Amino acid sequence: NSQLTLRALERGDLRFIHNLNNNRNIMSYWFEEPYESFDELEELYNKHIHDNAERRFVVEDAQKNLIGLVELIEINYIHRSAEFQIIIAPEHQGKGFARTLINRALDYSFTILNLHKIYLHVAVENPKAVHLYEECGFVEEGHLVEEFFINGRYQDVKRMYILQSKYLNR
Amino acid sequence: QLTLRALERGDLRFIHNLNNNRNIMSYWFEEPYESFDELEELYNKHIHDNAERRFVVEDAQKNLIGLVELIEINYIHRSAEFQIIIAPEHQGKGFARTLINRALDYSFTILNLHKIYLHVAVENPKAVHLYEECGFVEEGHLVEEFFINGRYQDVKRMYILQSKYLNR
Amino acid sequence: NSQLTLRALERGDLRFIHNLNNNRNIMSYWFEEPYESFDELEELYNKHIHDNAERRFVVEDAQKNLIGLVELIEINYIHRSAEFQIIIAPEHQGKGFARTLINRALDYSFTILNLHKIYLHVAVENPKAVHLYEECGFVEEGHLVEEFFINGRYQDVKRMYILQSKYLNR
Amino acid sequence: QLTLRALERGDLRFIHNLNNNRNIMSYWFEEPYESFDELEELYNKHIHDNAERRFVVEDAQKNLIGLVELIEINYIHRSAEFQIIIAPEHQGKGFARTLINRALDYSFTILNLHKIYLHVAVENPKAVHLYEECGFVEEGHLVEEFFINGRYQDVKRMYILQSKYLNR
Amino acid sequence: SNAMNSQLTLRALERGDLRFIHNLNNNRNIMSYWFEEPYESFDELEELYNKHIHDNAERRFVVEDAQKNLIGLVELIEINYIHRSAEFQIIIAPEHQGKGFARTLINRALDYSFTILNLHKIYLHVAVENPKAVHLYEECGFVEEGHLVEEFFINGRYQDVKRMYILQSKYLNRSE
Amino acid sequence: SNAMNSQLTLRALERGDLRFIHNLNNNRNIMSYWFEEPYESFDELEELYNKHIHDNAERRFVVEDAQKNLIGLVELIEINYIHRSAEFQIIIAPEHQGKGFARTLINRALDYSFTILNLHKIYLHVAVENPKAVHLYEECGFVEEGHLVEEFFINGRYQDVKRMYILQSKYLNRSE
Amino acid sequence: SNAMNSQLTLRALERGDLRFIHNLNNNRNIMSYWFEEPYESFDELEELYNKHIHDNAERRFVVEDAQKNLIGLVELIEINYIHRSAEFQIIIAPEHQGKGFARTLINRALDYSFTILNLHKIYLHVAVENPKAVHLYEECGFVEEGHLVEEFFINGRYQDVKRMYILQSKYLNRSE
Amino acid sequence: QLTLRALERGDLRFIHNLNNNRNIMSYWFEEPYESFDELEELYNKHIHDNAERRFVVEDAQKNLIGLVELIEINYIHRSAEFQIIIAPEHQGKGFARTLINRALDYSFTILNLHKIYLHVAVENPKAVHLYEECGFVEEGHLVEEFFINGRYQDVKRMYILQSKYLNR
Amino acid sequence: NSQLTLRALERGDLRFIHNLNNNRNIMSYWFEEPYESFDELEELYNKHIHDNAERRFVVEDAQKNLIGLVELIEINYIHRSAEFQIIIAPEHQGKGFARTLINRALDYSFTILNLHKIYLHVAVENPKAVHLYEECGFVEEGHLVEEFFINGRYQDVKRMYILQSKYLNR
Amino acid sequence: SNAMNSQLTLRALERGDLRFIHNLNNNRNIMSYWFEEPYESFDELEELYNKHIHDNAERRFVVEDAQKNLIGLVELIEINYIHRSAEFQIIIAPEHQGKGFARTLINRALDYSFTILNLHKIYLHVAVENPKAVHLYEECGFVEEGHLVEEFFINGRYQDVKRMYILQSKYLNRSE
Amino acid sequence: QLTLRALERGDLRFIHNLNNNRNIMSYWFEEPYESFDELEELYNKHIHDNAERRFVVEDAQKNLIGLVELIEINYIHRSAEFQIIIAPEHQGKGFARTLINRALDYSFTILNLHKIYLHVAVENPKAVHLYEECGFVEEGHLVEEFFINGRYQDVKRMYILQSKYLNR
């Protein structure tokens, strides 16, 4: 876990991202459609190079294998909030890495970006993920009813948050 | 008596004036005191943006009463965020329920949406209660979500579904 | 009726069109949303100036009052087909003008554009319009089930057609 | 065994080859013999077009089997047109029903659409019958709709609704 | 009268003439003489006019009287400077149609073609069902070189046209 | 042999074919059949090709054998979708000239014109001094509709050309 | 009077205010307070204004009375949203200089900075030779954090400036 | 009395009118009947072109009398081509010699040129003689150089050097 | 001589042209400065790709060695005239090739472009070139006085011409 | 050793150095010295580099040894040519950190500023929690002119910085 | 042996290296340490600029020896500024006089200029003397013209005319 590192997404990482963004199971966790041509991915990457409202990271191990991704999006200049999102590549799921990645994202948010609040959304049908986020200090602030159409029906999600003061006072 | 219609370029001075009232802008969690030229250039940028519908409200004499907007319209999840402003001089005249219902009608009978949601400060209980009367229910109590008037404030997230609106 | 004329849509006519395109009742006949800023209307007009796949007409009386509009859209280079659509302004509805406008559109289609087939769509809940189109020589070729979401539910439409040979052999 | 995936630039030579078979292109009522550069530049133009989803079909060895597309996707009416091609060398291997069902699954379980429709020549009764087995029903018999192989031909328009597919 | 005809003068089409052109190009009867669809928005007309200002393959002229009334238009299109040929086309303004000015407009166009632009061949197309025009072109020295079968769809049917021509040598030279 | 002719297939021209086209367009003999100047840099060719990729008024096809050898080119230009007419033009690659494939290339072009693009009339121009081509077009059902006098300057003098045509009705219909 | 001061309101600068700004930016005396050269064509001003309409790193406000007379301008520049700091600058319109409105304009700017934009630190620069301004900023809660030596060339010599600051905590919190 | 000054946009209608006189345009071997918009767009294109100086001639009442131009100015060879037009209503008033000399003065005393040349039809001997009086001499008799009024015509090329003009 | 061919200039020929255009002796025959970067040459080539007023040719032998260049410039749409210019590469000068190249240029002018008149300029201090042009049918029509500054003084040139009728009537 | 220090030379940053810069700008420890966020894609870096090639308000230099190993970077930003001031910033490459080259890099930057660019004042910012750097700058003749309170958010808290300066007169002149 | 030729893109690394020698750049009063990319983009910007001619000097083996430039060429006044650099490793080999004379030859026999001038520091008397040997004479002693190496320095402005060079 101490060997896992976050770094900025680069153009050379996009084939890795393309595999994730076309995976039905993975994209269901992001409430997203699993369809994205390499050209859509790359042109959107190009469009957002200078966009200050997001930070997209890839996660690598000590051997520079790509493990997953973490992103902070909708970063707000006044309210000092952002949304957190995470993917672990299928081959690295279930290795106990997620806690470390969540903590690295919170460290970045609260010690580098000087944010006040990080929030996330997670399906109520993924209670193991809800419980992992709770272990990391997130607390439920909403239960959003039929928010997303995911796999053939409308599904509910928890909205969960953590504040800078709680994180820095651990 | 009151009509809803698409926002037009000639309505921008009305919007700009509302944007120089910090109390009104705080209801939308939007930063007040935007330049007329920022407002106009954003209007230009979003002419063809299918993810929003911005309306003005007029009376029979063409006086501008207020604004109603559906934003962040997502056509897979079939959801949108609703917001409304009534100009200070027209507040307390009993217009709001009708306008809220007309916005929901547009959402559910024209755009074929599934869910409309809104955010309202917990320190505005009169507004919470009006939205409840219109069929909205609380689904979140968002902690320290917005910095408004010198402190972080909590907001309710409230929603209504197409099925509830149509009585299904 | 002999005093009604078709001409090409011009920029100076766009305020007339704007009134029609924001009218809920009128736009329901076109299966369309009644929302269009003047800027959306005008920028789309600009975009399609040289588009050979459509012809948009306004209808005027002898005094140059704007009566309505007729359009031929989706004009196809190989199949020689197009879709017909019509609006009569509220103040001129119910004056018996529609037959004349339909006939002028068919004349243009079959004697000027050298098209083979004109088709249209009309809601099954508008039987008076179905009957008018039948009087003008259109015949039903489809009953499209729940094709359009119009005023709170999915509605069925007739697809109706007429061929060049039938029109020119009257 | 067979997978559906988004069309990519590397797949364009496969599409181009299919486009030089007039019999295959006639099933789509599309003009054959398009230049590779027209095909590529159209692909480029539509990268961000939300009104289509173009898929290729591959086997486990990454051989390209065919194409499946959802076009004219309308997110108010919630409808789209479906089309499928199986390459001549893979036709008659029993793939088609599965691919049709996977396209309907995508339409109804991911895109949240209400209606899928298609067009098929009346002189292709085997195809009509396959679509009927998959739950499509005729809603039109379009007279002299398309000029194909030297004459005007009639086509069936066929449809299936989300409710029928999900068994509602 | 030749005294009146002699007062008709050539100048190029300019932007301020486009409302006049727009009227002609949306007139079914007039555009039938050009085998053209009678539909053109002012914006299509103007944008095409702008695009072709510097195009050396065409010339668009108006003919005006001494009071600057626009009597008609004469144009050369498809000008080729190796073959030295061009297609001629003419419209008379509705108010001046049927007054006997046509020969003068044609004369101005042929004089320009053969004495100024130094072309070798001018050709034209004219419907077989428009004998008045055929006969005028014959008077001007044009001769039939083709009878094009079902060339154009006009008013609900395919129609035949004559292709007619005149050469610079015939125009300029004395043969007696 | 019809067995060999039947193996010739159509596809559109693409960018990778342009070195082949460049050779044809700089060949004096070949370009004389097209009444064209035999001068075109690769850059002029390529830029014009790019400009017209999406132009619906033309079609450019190559005809290839089973081994993908390029046998020739057939094109439609000036396609008009009201009159439903186009001009046809053909080149056979130098290595395949004089082998009797021309009829097959013409057949592929007419089949495409009349069974796929749904045109009404195909016409062409051919020099009167090129009787081999005139006679081939006659065999294919083309008929003379014009004899254009001194139409083109070719090899130091003005030359006459036939305009020839065929209609979709004649091509598609049985008359016996 | 506080009754009059309370009627002063904030709005953003817009294009129609630029003639007012042009007068200020070409006034030697006024621009000396900003350590700036007093030269700016209307075209430079307008083009820079256009360029920065959407720039989130600055805010330009005018303060107006109830009759919409422009009393002055307050701006934030170099806004940084990690450090949550910005530089403050102020001009009073010549007609309203010396009337005691300055504190009100500063109050509007600090209220906006700390209650709306949620900044942590506002800082400013003021010449040591401008004690009237130093003293006003001290009354508003600003404190010196630097004495910058020969920072700016103003009127023929290098001059020293104070850097002064106030924090959001001091502004918002009660300490008694 | 007469002044030479730079051509300006407001003078373009005067030039356009002269361009619709074929006799006047033939003196310059320029094609007559150019559109006003071609003339204006060419004027725009050449605003910064250092290879030409186009002048108009005005009287004391600001009536436009004519045009004088120096074109094809080459700053290595130090040569330029001269052309002059006097409007028909002002021809035969004795202006031309003075204007020619003023153009040569500009060429030799301001632009520091070495050689000015011109072309004149051999069938215009009165013009040839006027140029000779101004110091120009024939250096060529160009055979069938220009097609003018239905036939190829011969022209004289005539020149004067800076040394001759300054009397060196 | 029968083995020498003209073809259109191509981008791959530009290094050959660059050598010629930086040669003082060669450029003196063209009244030109011997200074042209490869980038100036190539950007001017690009600018004139579609310019119909010039035709630039390279001359090759049977082995595809580049021999020289011939150009027709200032080609005029009305007057049907053009200026001819020629360079033979230093290594191929004095082999008797010039006559053939001149004749190929006249053939192109008079049998392909349908021009009426070809003219040229040649320094009076190059009488051997004047005489070669006379042998090819050119005749003097001017003696231009101090026309060009060439190598430190103003030099005179002959202007010489040939007409289509004379060439085609040989 | 001064013999080794004397072999360090200045040149401008160029595009081929950007992979080196990318490593520095994504290093948390290094960017903390610059009060900067340690996140920059290669594309952001390169596009910003391109944009500023001709910007006269900055200079970006690398310092290299005799073998062309990159030892560090020295930059001037916010260069103002009326006030004649600029901000200085420095990074030593990770492989060369802690080897005693820093003074030499600073010397090269001050020599350039005062003997070549003809600036009057160079200033810098340095964390109060980075006394090693404060002490090096003092040795070089920089003096504190400010103690900026809670200026920057670094590693989870607001930190104070010194602003330090040196003038051209002090650098160039002998005072003994 | 030595040849002058136009600067080319492949020569830019040579120029860049000279630009990182402050002593060499001080002879031109140019700021040293320019980025390779600034140098290259300036080269691109000035490809068609007729106001300069930049040359490199090469030996028979194609080694780059130095640079010679004519800048600020004005074609009315017929003047230009001359500058020369010989690379340190080739200085003191007796090349300079020949190169200076070749630059003057180009100026006076090809470009047809009237005056060439240069600037040289008064503290470089050896260079002053070399230019005098080549026919240049002082026309100015410019006081504190340039800030070079920590102080303002005086420079001579020196010139030669076409007449003097050609012996007229």
UniProtKB/Swiss-Prot annotation, chains B, D, H, K:
One BP annotation, GO:
spermidine catabolic process
Sequence similarity: Belongs to the acetyltransferase family.
**At which positions is Mg(2+) bound?**
E30, E72
List the subcellular locations.
Answer: Cytoplasm
Cellular compartments per GO CC: cytoplasm
State the SUPFAM superfamilies in the record: Acyl-CoA N-acyltransferases (Nat)
User: Gene3D superfamilies, from UniProt?
Assistant: 3.40.630.30
What does the record give as the organism's lineage? Answer: Bacteria, Pseudomonadati, Pseudomonadota, Gammaproteobacteria, Vibrionales
Q: Where is this site: Could be important for selectivity toward long polyamines?
A: E81
Q: What is this protein called?
A: Spermidine N(1)-acetyltransferase
Q: Pathway, per Swiss-Prot/TrEMBL?
A: Amine and polyamine degradation; spermidine degradation; Amine and polyamine degradation; spermine degradation
Keywords assigned by UniProt, alphabetized: Acyltransferase, Cytoplasm, Magnesium, Metal-binding, Transferase
List its EC numbers.
2.3.1.57
Swiss-Prot record, chains E, F, G, J:
Organism annotation? Vibrio cholerae serotype O1 (strain ATCC 39315 / El Tor Inaba N16961)
What is the E.C. number?
Answer: 2.3.1.57
Any idea which GO molecular function terms this record carries? diamine N-acetyltransferase activity; magnesium ion binding
Role played: Involved in the protection against polyamine toxicity by regulating their concentration. Catalyzes the transfer of an acetyl group from acetyl coenzyme A (AcCoA) to the primary amino groups of spermidine to yield N(1)- and N(8)-acetylspermidine. It can use polyamines such as spermine and N(1)-acetylspermine, but not putrescine or cadaverine.
Q: Is the keyword Nucleotidyltransferase in the record?
A: no
For this protein, the activity regulation entry reads: Allosterically regulated by polyamines. Polyamines trigger conformational changes and induce the symmetric closed dodecameric state of the protein when they bind to their allosteric sites.
Query: Which Gene3D superfamilies is this protein grouped with?
Result: 3.40.630.30
Checking PROSITE patterns in the record gives:
GNAT
Q: Which gene encodes it?
A: speG
What is this protein's name? Spermidine N(1)-acetyltransferase
Q: Which residues bind Mg(2+)?
A: E36, E78
Give binding positions for spermine: M31, E36, E44, H52, I53, H54, D55, E87, F88, Q89
Positions of spermidine binding: E36, E44
The annotated active site, in chain numbering, is: Y137 (proton donor)
**Residue ranges of domain N-acetyltransferase in the record:** 8-165
Return the InterPro entries for the record: Acyl_CoA_acyltransferase, GNAT_dom
Acyltransferase among the record's keywords? yes
Ranked from the top, the taxonomy reads: Bacteria, Pseudomonadati, Pseudomonadota, Gammaproteobacteria, Vibrionales
